[PDB]
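To assess whether the prediction recovers the assembly geometry, we first specified each molecular entity separately, as shown.
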Amino acid sequence: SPWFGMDIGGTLVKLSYFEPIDITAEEEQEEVESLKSIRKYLTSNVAYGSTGIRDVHLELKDLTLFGRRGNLHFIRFPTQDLPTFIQMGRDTVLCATGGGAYKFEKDFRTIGNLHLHKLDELDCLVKGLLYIDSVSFNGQAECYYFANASEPERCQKMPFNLDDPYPLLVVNIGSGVSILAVHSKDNYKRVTGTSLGGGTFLGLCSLLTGCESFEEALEMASKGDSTQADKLVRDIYGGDYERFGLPGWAVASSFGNMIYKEKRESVSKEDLARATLVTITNNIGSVARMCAVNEKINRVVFVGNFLRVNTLSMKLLAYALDYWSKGQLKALFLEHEGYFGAVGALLGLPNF
Amino acid sequence: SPWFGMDIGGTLVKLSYFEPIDITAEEEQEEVESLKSIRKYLTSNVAYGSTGIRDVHLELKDLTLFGRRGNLHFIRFPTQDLPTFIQMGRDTVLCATGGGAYKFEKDFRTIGNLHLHKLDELDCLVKGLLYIDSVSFNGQAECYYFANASEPERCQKMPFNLDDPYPLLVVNIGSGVSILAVHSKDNYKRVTGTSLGGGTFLGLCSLLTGCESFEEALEMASKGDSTQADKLVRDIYGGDYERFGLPGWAVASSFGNMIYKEKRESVSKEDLARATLVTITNNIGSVARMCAVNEKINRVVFVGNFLRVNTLSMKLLAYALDYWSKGQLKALFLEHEGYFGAVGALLGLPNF
Ligand SMILES: CCS(=O)(=O)Nc1ccc(CC(=O)N2CCN(c3ccc(C#N)nn3)CC2)cc1
Ligand SMILES: CCS(=O)(=O)Nc1ccc(CC(=O)N2CCN(c3ccc(C#N)nn3)CC2)cc1
Ligand SMILES: Nc1ncnc2c1ncn2[C@@H]1O[C@H](COP(=O)(O)OP(N)(=O)O)[C@@H](O)[C@H]1O
Ligand SMILES: Nc1ncnc2c1ncn2[C@@H]1O[C@H](COP(=O)(O)OP(N)(=O)O)[C@@H](O)[C@H]1O
Ligand SMILES: [Mg+2]
Ligand SMILES: [Mg+2]
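The predicted structure of the complete assembly is given in tokenized form:
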């Protein structure tokens, strides 16, 4: 039985697979051809079908898990393509989390003799995050931050130690946003959430710009100027609003200059992509800051796949959290952001 | 010297004008023809030029102010048209607030001998709100709420008494959003703000639907189904997410179904208008609820012109605040929502 952890989200399926590397001479004879073929298929390819991808750079090597040494692999594909995954599977214990573990329960059971064990998406997130940070990223820090995030000449990635992880605010930016307050390994609450998340960025971008991939949306945004669409404090006051410490550059109204027809006629699609990214990211940062202040937590870690290959949003979050909190809060990031639920599922395997 | 209070916002200019009604036989002789002409022009017309409107239904009659009896009138026009207003004024003490009091300071001073006194936009909001509620809306409650906002068969406008106004959370939904915590008549702080406000609704709506008025945007939204654009919890889980009490109908990802090309091709412009309204309104409600919980305030009053002739957003706020706070918070509304800054400015007149 291959060891898989699966997080079926609203947008992406995340899969963690443990490849044993201490396979004996006898265990290799006693392995069934279908199990050898699956292991070879997964380790021999970095693209699976037309939409599956193995994130090779995230692989954890020579991990000891459940008493065996092996490599921990990380794979993703769109939830839209799960029927293809299941159809391939029909031609066996699966720990599954995320909403899709419930929605597609009946589909997984079309695979004969498959044992489906549903686990909670946020329990799995916490357990997976704590595990990866505990075992390190092949000796390197799993957690990092942007040092001196207020000065761009100095803003650089630096490692952050999470040996005492508690308390922690976890901001899970997926299709939507969940915000968690973690007080201990078995004590955490979902403080709140927002529906303005990664799916809002991509959905609005596609409506506004016609982009048809997450990565193309980011590339457009990198070329845009969000101030062409946004109304700034200095557009309203002529400068800073000093009485309440609002700098002239702060956004007073996202997309607020688009109420003027002449401005709608001159804005570029790249400007609209950047304004969408900035709007979503600032709102997440602001909600994270309010939750942090109320939960009395000063370490805020942002995860989920809205931030993969998305340095613009990470730097924006690093800078905004530091600036608006007057330096009281720290934006933290994790190399395996995307995959913690899938790992937490995999870790539930001994219970079955 | 006519008595005017002006709030020049990022989007709208709001003007409060006190019409004296106890004018003597001698005071009428001693009044200059330009002052009689302005008073007649304002009381004889409900539309001013092409874009000025007097909200006749809001007028406060037989108000005693500064020792004179008169009528308090409420007038609005787009900040974009302020040059026309100033040009008409060139062919005199003005208390002015909002960002435009600073940005257009030099323009107001083109009016010979005009004395411009700038006042803070949130000081003026608090003073004006407390004043109007204190004098009543011609004997009727200035403040109201939607009773039994969870049951639509019972959801009806009902009056709310604010004789002891403190503490109060004031959510000012204009171009952007300011959130205030009012502890006493001279003790209040701006807790935070969000840039997802009324200008975001109108700007995104215009980009997405081509609507070209606030009122047309609301009319489109009233005909739409936001769930055509939004991804709901039940789209992700197949039902409720029970472990964290998220009902299947809650929005998991605003515009989140627009990541799928086929869904973008079938959504209507009315659906996109409604999804924009719902997205903005829920986010304001959520931010208001977090601030309320942290400031330890259970009365939340929503003002600003995003809510004028906007019952959909008011009912959405009433319902959402009650539902998500498990009944701990009350959404309150005010008949003169839009105009409190302009009134507060007018009330600063004795200081000059
Ligand atoms: C991880 C479970 S998921 O996969 O299904 N994704 C998911 C689901 C829901 C949400 C939004 C949320 O958590 N929400 C909705 C907005 N909420 C409001 C709304 C109005 C007010 C007021 N007034 N207050 N709160 C709080 C609760 C985000 C992501
Ligand atoms: C009434 C003055 S106005 O006329 O000029 N209108 C106006 C001006 C600014 C705002 C937004 C705001 O108040 N903002 C911006 C967002 N903010 C953030 C952003 C990121 C993070 C993080 N991490 N935290 N806070 C807090 C402060 C709304 C309306
Ligand atoms: N290849 C990709 N395809 C679709 N969305 C992608 C993507 N790469 C990054 N993203 C972003 O990641 C978000 C989903 O993150 P994720 O954490 O996996 O959400 P979920 N709800 O599926 O569990 C999307 O909303 C989008 O903003
Ligand atoms: N006639 C109208 N024209 C433009 N916007 C209007 C409007 N009637 C209502 N609105 C709404 O009111 C909002 C402005 O409210 P307001 O409180 O006056 O903001 P502000 N920043 O000008 O001080 C706009 O963003 C729009 O959503
Ligand atoms: Mg997820
Ligand atoms: Mg205003």
